[PDB]
Amino acid sequence: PITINNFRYSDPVNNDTIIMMEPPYCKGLDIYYKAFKITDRIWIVPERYEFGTKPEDFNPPSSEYYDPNYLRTDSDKDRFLQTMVKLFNRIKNNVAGEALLDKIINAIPYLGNSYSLLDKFDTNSNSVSFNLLEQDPSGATTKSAMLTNLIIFGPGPVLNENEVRGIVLRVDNKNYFPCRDGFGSIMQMAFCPEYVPTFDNSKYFQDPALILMHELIHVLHGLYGMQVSSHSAEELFTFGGQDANLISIDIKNDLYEKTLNDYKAIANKLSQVTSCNDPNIDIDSYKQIYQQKYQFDKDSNGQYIVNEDKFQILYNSIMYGFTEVELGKKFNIKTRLSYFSMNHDPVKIPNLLDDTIYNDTEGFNIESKDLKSEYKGQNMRVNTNAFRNVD
């Protein structure tokens, strides 16, 4: 069973669920931020997403809403953390959302990539590992390495604009994404639970759990090494609905053939693996995990091969099994019709933390307040205390 853990931002590091983490884009730069393991293979780092930014990138210049002082204090950070804990509980408490989390957790990044040694599992790129400080039983503070799937940061410059990105590796003077190429990588999220969009199609604000789950679906594409590159299509598959129907059959077919091919390449790679650089990794245990993850068969030789039909089911469940439209349905959260709607001013949700405004089994749509029906708890003309406008 999946547990979402509990912690207070000020609790002490413990080498387990609270650590000082060197984020992957800080590899070897020895900058550490306090991080929290919400659940296996998922960390929350309550900080602003700052990789590749100037500190002046963080003010309004001269839809997009800024505030450079959001998430800078212990109090800010603790509020953000408790909020994320609630949003993960809200996701997990519906069986649809917990299947999402289970798939994300299980979809571990392959221990290597297109430019990794073919016969070795490689736990040593920043695309699969972060460093931490660990506190020895002897009193010494040492530095180690950990495998993970997802790290969730607070937002970058623009508060109400969440992004998901796989780790970029620099290889032969090129940008390379193991999350586009079958292997997957650590995925990183810049996420802001307080600032959600609005829409009509009679005006509604979005439930932040469903913006979270939309982002987790991008994270799932990426763990499966299926992030859709330059098309965007990634955003249409993720939204689902009739929008998915706009990616032509011609493009669905290149994407499908392309992924089929990477998986074949990975099937071949998995067959050669005879050792790992990291003593702590059980070679045969990881081979089974990856057989299971990629849904490979074994041939008579002992080789791994792609069984076409099992690939088609897997692909189908990755691209079509989880969308915003369907998750909204299953959770009773109201959704836009189509990705393409003028983005009305977002709004602030100042208190997700209070069960009278938002709980973890029903969201804003609390039935004891008779706000379940017709999604009244998301209606801007009905549930007037839940939001605030922004300046």
Side-chain angles (χ1 to χ4, degrees):
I2 288 172
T3 289
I4 315 296
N5 308 131
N6 318 274
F7 17 54
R8 299 292 340 195
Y9 187 80
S10 67
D11 293 0
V13 312
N14 51 232
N15 286 324
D16 185 8
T17 67
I18 312 176
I19 63 186
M20 301 290 303
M21 169 201 282
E22 195 188 63
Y25 290 136
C26 297
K27 202 199 206 193
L29 293 181
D30 300 302
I31 299 170
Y32 303 90
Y33 297 100
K34 199 187 208 202
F36 308 81
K37 177 156 157 210
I38 188 130
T39 204
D40 265 319
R41 296 285 194 140
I42 309 173
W43 292 83
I44 292 166
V45 171
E47 302 284 332
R48 304 302 296 267
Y49 188 111
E50 263 169 16
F51 320 89
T53 79
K54 281 124 209 197
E56 216 204 73
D57 285 345
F58 276 81
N59 314 290
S62 310
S63 44
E64 305 173 5
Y65 176 85
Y66 310 73
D67 166 7
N69 281 306
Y70 181 84
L71 249 201
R72 306 297 196 157
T73 87
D74 270 31
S75 275
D76 293 357
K77 302 175 184 219
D78 187 66
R79 193 174 163 248
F80 173 95
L81 169 73
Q82 310 316 298
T83 295
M84 290 310 286
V85 158
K86 186 174 206 179
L87 288 187
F88 273 79
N89 279 296
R90 156 88 158 141
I91 300 177
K92 157 201 133 250
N93 297 146
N94 187 121
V95 291
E98 101 120 66
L100 210 211
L101 282 173
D102 197 275
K103 203 105 174 172
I104 279 172
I105 287 171
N106 282 324
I108 75 151
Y110 185 90
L111 289 190
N113 58 51
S114 280
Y115 299 110
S116 128
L117 296 185
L118 48 53
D119 36 9
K120 224 168 124 79
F121 275 152
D122 186 20
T123 81
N124 193 227
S125 88
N126 67 159
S127 65
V128 294
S129 269
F130 59 75
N131 302 317
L132 58 155
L133 292 168
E134 84 180 42
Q135 313 205 338
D136 216 82
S138 88
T141 294
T142 39
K143 173 167 157 148
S144 20
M146 220 180 245
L147 292 177
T148 201
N149 287 12
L150 166 72
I151 297 157
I152 295 175
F153 297 94
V158 182
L159 301 185
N160 65 315
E161 210 191 313
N162 305 314
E163 207 145 313
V164 159
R165 303 164 213 100
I167 304 299
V168 200
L169 294 182
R170 278 310 285 201
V171 148
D172 184 55
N173 212 81
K174 291 285 162 86
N175 273 345
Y176 167 65
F177 301 79
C179 68
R180 294 172 181 177
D181 153 81
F183 297 99
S185 61
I186 293 177
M187 306 298 288
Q188 285 181 320
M189 189 185 317
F191 184 80
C192 191
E194 276 202 309
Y195 289 62
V196 308
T198 53
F199 61 99
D200 38 68
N201 47 299
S202 291
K203 245 217 264 209
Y204 293 85
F205 52 82
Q206 193 44 84
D207 178 333
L210 183 64
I211 305 129
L212 189 33
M213 283 192 271
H214 176 104
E215 303 308 318
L216 289 173
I217 297 165
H218 285 316
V219 165
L220 185 85
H221 296 159
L223 297 165
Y224 270 92
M226 280 171 63
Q227 209 212 56
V228 164
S229 128
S230 272
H231 287 87
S232 103
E234 170 67 29
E235 212 80 51
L236 269 28
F237 276 119
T238 293
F239 186 81
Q242 206 70 19
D243 295 1
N245 271 343
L246 297 164
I247 318 164
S248 68
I249 186 63
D250 307 277
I251 292 141
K252 286 181 207 215
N253 216 74
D254 314 312
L255 299 165
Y256 167 95
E257 290 309 313
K258 176 239 139 49
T259 306
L260 175 56
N261 221 249
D262 298 332
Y263 275 41
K264 269 170 195 195
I266 288 189
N268 185 225
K269 286 197 55 142
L270 228 216
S271 301
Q272 335 268 257
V273 177
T274 46
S275 49
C276 187
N277 66 227
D278 178 334
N280 291 276
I281 264 126
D282 184 321
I283 313 296
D284 304 318
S285 215
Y286 269 71
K287 287 172 136 215
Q288 294 167 283
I289 279 152
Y290 294 145
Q291 194 191 337
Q292 162 58 50
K293 166 172 189 214
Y294 292 99
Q295 289 297 282
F296 287 146
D297 289 353
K298 263 154 168 152
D299 69 6
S300 64
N301 305 322
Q303 180 85 4
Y304 297 98
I305 54 177
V306 171
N307 169 279
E308 191 211 307
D309 277 6
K310 265 145 68 99
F311 166 78
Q312 212 161 287
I313 297 155
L314 168 67
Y315 188 88
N316 280 356
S317 82
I318 305 310
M319 298 310 228
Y320 295 115
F322 306 77
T323 61
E324 177 170 339
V325 166
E326 300 298 302
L327 292 161
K329 255 180 222 196
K330 306 279 218 304
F331 272 75
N332 187 236
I333 290 127
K334 177 142 221 77
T335 64
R336 319 194 271 321
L337 303 162
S338 150
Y339 203 63
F340 296 91
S341 327
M342 194 224 100
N343 60 7
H344 302 231
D345 295 311
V347 298
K348 184 178 185 199
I349 319 288
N351 203 81
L352 301 166
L353 284 157
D354 165 37
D355 291 1
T356 271
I357 299 171
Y358 191 89
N359 75 41
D360 70 11
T361 47
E362 305 179 279
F364 292 117
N365 301 164
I366 329 194
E367 133 126 82
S368 74
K369 317 230 321 175
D370 187 50
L371 290 173
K372 232 196 151 158
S373 277
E374 311 140 72
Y375 324 91
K376 288 179 288 130
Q378 282 179 269
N379 202 127
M380 278 180 68
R381 221 191 42 144
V382 174
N383 200 185
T384 32
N385 195 38
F387 71 121
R388 299 281 167 250
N389 274 83
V390 93
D391 310 275

